């Protein structure tokens, strides 16, 4: 029903109304009270990325990409693990690389619980500017595949 209207994700539906949330398909009252306790949990976290010395980068200088990871909501239990067996904490890899070239340029793993930081540093070769992307990909939830074009040199 969701692919005949134009909608695919849970952003293409949380972006709805409570009543246009219960007018997509069937409801009953457990099913609000789990689906909202879910988009409660979930990972709501933006980005913020930082370069130093942008321009005046050459070939054979170590660079450093900062990641300050913006948690907009409370982190209030693990994650909802209905089909899992364990109480896992969430993880977080903060990957950079080369979307054409295939090149894993750096990842780090993360846990966070609030808005915290993450260094990277890597190694670009010479001539001149390297179009890298940076993903920031959890081992538990879909839908915050954030990754954000730039370059360097």
């Known amino acids: 029903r969701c ?3 134009g909608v695919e994700s849970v952003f293409d539906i949380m ?4 009543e246009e949330r ?3 398909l069937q409801l009953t ?4 009270a789990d689906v909202a306790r879910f988009c409660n949990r979930y990972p709501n976290i933006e980005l913020s990325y930082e370069v130093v010395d942008k ?3 050459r070939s054979g200088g170590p660079v450093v990409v900062l990641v300050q990871l913006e948690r907009e909501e409370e982190v209030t239990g693990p994650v909802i693990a209905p089909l899992f ?7 977080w890899w903060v990957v950079i690389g080369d979307a054409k070239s295939n090149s894993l340029i750096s990842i780090k793993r993360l846990t966070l619980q609030q808005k915290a ?12 500017a390297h179009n890298y992307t940076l993903y920031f990909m959890s081992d538990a939830y879909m839908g915050c595949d954030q ?3 730039f370059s360097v040199d």
């Open 3 to 5: 692919t005949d209207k």
């Open 15 to 18: 972006e709805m109304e409570d």
């Open 22 to 24: 219960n007018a997509l």
């Open 29 to 32: 009252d457990s099913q609000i």
């Open 55 to 57: 321009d005046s980068i």
């Open 85 to 91: 067996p364990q109480k896992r904490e969430e993880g």
């Open 117 to 128: 930081k993450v260094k990277l540093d890597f190694v670009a070769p010479a001539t001149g």
């Open 147 to 149: 990754e954000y074009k």
